[PDB]
Amino acid sequence: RRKVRLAQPYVGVFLKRDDSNESDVVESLDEIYHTGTFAQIHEMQDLGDKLRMIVMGHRRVH
Amino acid sequence: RRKVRLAQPYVGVFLKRDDSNESDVVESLDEIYHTGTFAQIHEMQDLGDKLRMIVMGHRRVH
Numbered sequence A, B: 001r002r003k004v005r006l007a008q009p010y011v012g013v014f015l016k017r018d019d020s021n022e023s024d025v026v027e028s029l030d031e032i033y034h035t036g037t038f039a040q041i042h043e044m045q046d047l048g049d050k051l052r053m054i055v056m057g058h059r060r061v062h
Helices: A022-027 B022-027
Strands: A011-016 A032-039 A059-061 B010-016 B032-040 B059-061
Touching: none
Parallel strands: none
Antiparallel strands: A011 A032, A032 A059, B010 B032, B032 B059
16 A cells, blocks of 8 residues: 555565565565566455455566 | 556557558658647556557647
8 A cells, every 4th residue: 555656566576485484574584585576566456355466477686 | 568667658649641551650650640639548458459458539739
């Protein structure tokens, strides 16, 4: 909801390392892999769940 | 796709002259009439084809 006001809507998707840990995601930023992919949000649906975001791989980066 | 990242997405609508010819459009810019109609894009669908783009008449210009 905070990025809606932004002129450019975009989202980055990364890859987590082995031994996934939800706590470590918020505790340590080194768990996530350096490589990532930035893209543009298409449209929010939130049909049944409040978060149903759509993610696509558009611009890969390291 | 290039205009999606643009802050202001707009599409221009013009009118072709007599003796329609696709090659002349890319070869000579005189074929298309000077008068145009700029308008904003609504939403891309591409249901059957990969290019199905909507045009509206909002701001006429000469």
